[PDB]
């Protein structure tokens, strides 16, 4: 049919009318580091990145202190 795409796209225009170019520019803050970098790698890098965005992000600086303590 593809006319049932129309109310789903009315939902999409409501989603784009939630925030008007606030997520395109702010998420483009991450996209400008992420544009033209292959985003299959950005899922692994986003995976371990968001995994370590909580804690122990760099952590290789700490392993030299983990030598004498462990």
């Amino acid at each position: 049919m593809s006319e049932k795409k129309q109310p789903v796209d009315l939902g999409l225009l409501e989603e784009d009318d939630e925030f008007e170019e606030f997520p395109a520019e702010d998420w483009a803050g991450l996209d400008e580091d992420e544009d033209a970098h292959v985003w299959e790698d950005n899922w692994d890098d986003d995976n371990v990145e968001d995994d370590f965005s909580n804690q122990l992000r760099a952590e290789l600086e700490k392993h030299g202190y983990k030598m004498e303590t462990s």
């Binding site: 593809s2 049932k4 989603e15 395109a24 985003w39 299959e40």
Partner: protein, 488 residues
């Protein structure tokens, strides 16, 4: 006054040529194509009419045409009327009535002349001979034009268009079952009608009329159908069954019949998403995963973007149930991206699986995914967290500690450790060895693949199934060359 007054009679005089040329091209192309033998040549205008419909779905047609452009509305087909022979003076008339509106002006209006659209369908639609194909080829394209802008009391005008549609053709028909190319057209044409004022239907009403008749019209085809249009009429029934049916003793496995040759190069995808949406509530892990991902991968023609966010979103919604959640990886379009822009923090919050934090995280910014309705598979997710996390424990080492991995699973007791690990053991999805020598629980955790482990029996079935798919594809390169050399 000079700005739009000088550019007013300029812009307009441009969709007139392509719409009149289009209706003469597909009208005279359809009648002039299948006129002699409609029964021999079939479905040649199937892709033509649907591609014109999807070609006119993105019409920017009426923006200013409420003001003094409405001469196109009282004019219509007017081809070869009032007498089937001696149409040469009517060949003069074709230029005449188009030329009358081109001398000075025309008395025009929008909402007055709607109801006497049945003046010619009382006596002669076009010719008194090709009345079915010229009747639907006359009426059915122009009804979404005037019944476009469904809002602003055109819903009642849509009801007038409904009863005119049924009243001339689809109350029963003029000849029950036409049994020609316009019967096969009238399947998806009448379907498309019912989808079009299905917005009128669900707008205020619900299931309680033409949908209940559509089972009788669904079986009035005699059964001898290829059932393509019968399947399209089934799709509105199943989408009607999406929002609230929940009973499974009819449509689920009962509606499941012969599974006819139902192709359309769209209807596999959207039919399959519909049955995967309803088969997604019992949490199908094997079947709906692969075939609903397949239905995501179908319909590449017009967009792969704007609609497949729904089969995609539902797909990853049921994919994170299994512990392994693949994100948006290989497809780059900023529609699915904004679709998962709320979903990203929680779908990355699947794998680490922290109970008390992510329980707050879901409902915390939960606006639209928890306003999407009744919190069902997310409420199964809320205790699926520790099951997918302990499935990652199954992807980790064997022995279960009482402090390290019990504390790590936020679950600090001897009983519940072996108990809920044992709830993963009663699944059968894993491989584990329940042993108590000193009280510690072992597992052999053998994830060894069938490489040097019964390979013949293992990809035995892979050989048979794969060769059947490749060899029915060999049938699919045998028979369409028969469909090439058939005409010559």
């Amino acid at each position: 006054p000079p700005g739009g007054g000088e550019q007013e009679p300029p812009p307009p005089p441009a969709p007139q040529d392509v719409e009149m040329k289009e209706e003469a091209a597909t009208g005279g192309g359809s009648t002039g194509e299948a006129d002699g033998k409609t029964a021999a040549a079939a479905a040649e205008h199937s892709q033509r009419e649907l591609d014109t419909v999807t070609l006119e779905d993105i019409k920017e047609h009426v923006k200013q045409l409420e003001k003094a452009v409405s001469g196109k509305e009282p004019r219509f087909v007017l081809r070869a009327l009032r007498m089937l022979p001696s149409t040469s003076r009517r060949l003069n008339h074709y230029v005449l009535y188009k030329a009358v509106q081109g001398f000075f002006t025309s008395n025009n209006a929008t909402r007055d002349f709607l109801l006497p659209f049945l003046e010619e369908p009382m006596d002669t639609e076009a010719d008194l001979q090709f009345r079915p194909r010229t009747g639907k080829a006359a009426s059915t394209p122009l009804l979404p034009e005037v019944e476009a802008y469904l809002q602003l009391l055109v819903v009642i005008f849509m009801m007038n268009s409904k009863r005119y549609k049924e009243a001339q053709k689809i109350s029963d028909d003029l000849m029950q079952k036409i049994s020609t190319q316009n019967r096969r057209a009238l399947d998806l044409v009448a379907a498309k009608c019912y989808y079009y004022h299905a917005r009128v239907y669900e707008f205020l009403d619900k299931l309680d009329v033409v949908r209940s008749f559509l089972h009788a019209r669904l079986r009035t085809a005699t059964l001898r159908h290829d059932a393509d249009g019968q399947a399209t009429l089934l799709n509105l029934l199943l989408r009607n069954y999406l929002h609230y049916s929940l009973y499974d003793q009819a449509e689920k496995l009962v509606s499941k019949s012969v599974f006819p040759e139902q192709a359309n190069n769209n209807e596999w995808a959207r039919y399959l998403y519909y049955t995967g949406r309803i088969k997604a509530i019992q949490l199908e892990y094997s079947e709906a995963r692969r075939t609903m991902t397949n239905a995501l991968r179908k319909a590449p023609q017009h967009t792969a973007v704007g609609f497949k966010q729904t089969v995609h979103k539902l797909l990853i919604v049921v994919e994170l149930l299994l512990g392994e959640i693949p994100d948006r990886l290989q497809f780059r379009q900023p529609s699915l991206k904004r679709s998962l822009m709320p979903y990203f923090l929680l779908t990355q919050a699947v794998r680490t699986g922290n109970l008390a934090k992510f329980n707050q995280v879901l409902d915390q910014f939960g606006e639209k995914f928890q306003a999407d309705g009744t919190y069902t598979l997310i409420i199964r997710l809320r205790h699926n967290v520790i099951k997918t996390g302990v499935r990652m424990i199954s992807l980790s080492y064997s022995r279960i500690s009482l402090a390290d991995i019990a504390q790590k699973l936020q679950l600090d007791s001897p009983e519940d450790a072996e108990f809920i690990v044992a709830k993963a053991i009663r699944d059968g999805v894993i491989e584990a060895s329940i042993n108590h020598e000193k009280g510690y629980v072992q597992s052999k955790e053998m994830i060894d693949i069938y490489s040097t482990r019964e390979p013949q029996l293992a990809f035995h079935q892979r050989i048979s199934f794969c060769l059947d798919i490749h060899n029915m594809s060999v049938k699919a390169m045998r028979f369409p060359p028969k469909s090439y050399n058939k005409d010559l």
